[PDB]
Structure 1
Amino acid sequence: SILDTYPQICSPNALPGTPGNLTKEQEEALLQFRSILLEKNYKERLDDSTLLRFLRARKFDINASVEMFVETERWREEYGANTIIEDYENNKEAEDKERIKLAKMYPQYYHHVDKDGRPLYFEELGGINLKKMYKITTEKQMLRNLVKEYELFATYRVPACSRRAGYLIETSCTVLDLKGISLSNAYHVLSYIKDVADISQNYYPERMGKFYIIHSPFGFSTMFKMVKPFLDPVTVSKIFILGSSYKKELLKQIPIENLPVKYGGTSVLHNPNDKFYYSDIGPWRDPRYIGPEGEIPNIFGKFTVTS
């Protein structure tokens, strides 16, 4: 299996309940959880990493974890998450074209890793113009992309990042740049935020590592109060709204050489004229860390910048 080609044990300095750092009870809870699922005839996604994410998400309450896992499996099948990557490749050209149209307006890109080896993910929202957004894509379409990225994250990014780190990597280090957004637009996209939060928390438990919100406008705290209601306690604990000295905070978590210059680091693209919103740079692009899973497809087609 592919799980045999990359570390399945987390760093010994990781949080409680993570692969390889279990207490005696958590270990037994894990064996019991798997035993129940096998008995119900489930066969995929029964590895320690996957099951421990569901267990952690429900504080090791086995009954709650089974319910969550069972619901997740139903959703994946009804939604088509299980063949989403396959379906994308069958219609790649068309997909890429649509994806390229939104890149400049809504930059979303991975760029290296944080100090623990987690994929470093960036999103900029100040350039978003809703009126134009609605002419290029739909809300459901955006959710589909989010689901597709979660699957890409799990099959290509996790293995490569884990091999480079020498330990299992299960989460990402996210930076949300709100520079230039208008609070008014923020309120209008609450339903989308809610849908994103629901998919993430219900079907992709424990995928959040560190989540930084920077350049938020005055009064953002008021708007975040509209969001907290549908975020569970653990999720909230991973979100950090940074102030004016945000660069210093990012530097505590991210190597200076991996952090882009505009965020306080020294990282630049091989070709200074290339755009970050067309880039996808990281271990999963390094032949030395790519395994049997093969290399990740290019999200922006021929425009994808990998260095």
Structure 2
Amino acid sequence: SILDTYPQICSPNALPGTPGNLTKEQEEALLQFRSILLEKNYKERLDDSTLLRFLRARKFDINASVEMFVETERWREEYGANTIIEDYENNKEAEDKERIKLAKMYPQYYHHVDKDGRPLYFEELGGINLKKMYKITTEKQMLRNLVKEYELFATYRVPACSRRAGYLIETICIVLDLKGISLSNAYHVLSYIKDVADISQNYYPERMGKFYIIHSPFGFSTMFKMVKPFLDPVTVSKIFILGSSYKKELLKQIPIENLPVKYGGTSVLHNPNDKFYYSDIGPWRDPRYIGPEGEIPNIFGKFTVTS
């Protein structure tokens, strides 16, 4: 499969329980877990990386990991995640036309990688006017956009970033810019955040690498206690709400040349009149690292900025 064509072992510098870094008991658990799933007629998504994500998510409790995996496989079928990329491509023009309507008001863009090679993903929320947004999208449409991205991440971004790094890259580095948000608006969208958290926690285990929140209102750290019940403590431990010294904090994790100027770095788009909210720059655009999966589709259509 495509998995044979990029590295499937993590760096030796990675966390415990990751591919290539297992203890003997963890290796034995992985073999037992795979054996159980094969005996239950599963054939897909049984690679080391996937299965160890599920095992780590349940602290190597095999039966709990089986339940989580069984529930994920059925969810993928019920929701349409297994065909979401193909379905998008079969209606690409109409879907891109609608997606671009959201982009300026709600920037969502990958831009290069962190120091360890993870895809680096930015969102900016301070330009959202909720009344205006809900004229051009629905909550469940935004949720499906996010699932489609999770599938693009796994299908295109992981392979390219892994080939670049020479080791398996399984996780994302997120920077969420909250400059200008209202905490009452945040409260009003808590049900959407819960929907995002439920799908992400239950069906996309161990995909989060690091999650920085910048420019948040003074009261955001305590408002965030309303989100924590939707998240596991492991996930919370990867979320860092940064203060006024955030630029240098990001630079511990991200090469300066990969970070936009406005967030402390030196990265500028090749045409400086282009907009980050139409951009999708990173190793998945480098022909050296694009493999037999082919190149990622361009989610902003003819407006997509790839340099």
Superposition deviation, residue 128 in structure 1: 0.3
Tell me the alpha carbon deviations over residues 46-83 of structure 1, each in whole angstroms, 9 at most, x when there is no partner. Answer: 00000000000000000000000000000000110000
Tell me the alpha carbon deviations over residues 153-200 of structure 1, each in whole angstroms, 9 at most, x when there is no partner. Answer: 000000000000000000011000000111111110100000001110
Partner residue in 1 for 2:58: 58
TM-score (norm: length of structure 1): 0.99
Partner residue in 2 for 1:134: 134
Distance in 2, matches of 1:54 and 1:206, equals 7
The 3-state SS of whatever aligns with 1:288 is: coil
Partner residue in 2 for 1:186: 186
The 3-state SS of whatever aligns with 1:112 is: strand
Distance in 2, matches of 1:69 and 1:225, equals 29
Distance in 2, matches of 1:133 and 1:47, equals 39
Tell me the alpha carbon deviations over residues 192-240 of structure 1, each in whole angstroms, 9 at most, x when there is no partner. Answer: 0000011101000000000000000011122101101111011101100
Distance in 2, matches of 1:174 and 1:221, equals 17
The 3-state SS of whatever aligns with 1:11 is: coil
Distance in 2, matches of 1:56 and 1:133, equals 37
Distance in 1, matches of 2:293 and 2:61, equals 33
The 3-state SS of whatever aligns with 2:141 is: helix
The 3-state SS of whatever aligns with 1:83 is: helix
Unaligned runs of 5+ in 1: none
Distance in 2, matches of 1:136 and 1:147, equals 19
Superposition deviation, residue 147 in structure 1: 0.4
Distance in 2, matches of 1:98 and 1:150, equals 19
CA RMSD of aligned residues (A): 0.5
Tell me the alpha carbon deviations over residues 232-290 of structure 1, each in whole angstroms, 9 at most, x when there is no partner. Answer: 01110110000110011100000000000000000000001000000000000001100
Distance in 2, matches of 1:205 and 1:97, equals 31
Q: Which ranges of 4 or more aligned residues in structure 1 deviate by more than 3 Å? A: none
Distance in 2, matches of 1:194 and 1:301, equals 30
Q: Does 1:79 align with 2:79?
A: yes
Superposition deviation, residue 98 in structure 1: 0.6
The 3-state SS of whatever aligns with 1:14 is: coil
Distance in 2, matches of 1:245 and 1:125, equals 20
The 3-state SS of whatever aligns with 2:84 is: helix
Distance in 2, matches of 1:230 and 1:183, equals 18
Superposition deviation, residue 294 in structure 1: 0.2
Tell me the alpha carbon deviations over residues 84-140 of structure 1, each in whole angstroms, 9 at most, x when there is no partner. Answer: 000000100010001000000000000000000000000000000100111101111
The 3-state SS of whatever aligns with 2:176 is: strand
The 3-state SS of whatever aligns with 2:226 is: coil
The 3-state SS of whatever aligns with 2:142 is: helix
Distance in 1, matches of 2:276 and 2:246, equals 20
Distance in 1, matches of 2:132 and 2:223, equals 23
How many corresponding residue pairs?
A: 307
Superposition deviation, residue 4 in structure 1: 1.1
Distance in 1, matches of 2:62 and 2:12, equals 24
The share of aligned pairs that are identical, in percent, is: 99
Superposition deviation, residue 142 in structure 1: 0.6
Distance in 2, matches of 1:121 and 1:286, equals 17
Tell me the alpha carbon deviations over residues 22-46 of structure 1, each in whole angstroms, 9 at most, x when there is no partner. Answer: 0000000000000000000000000
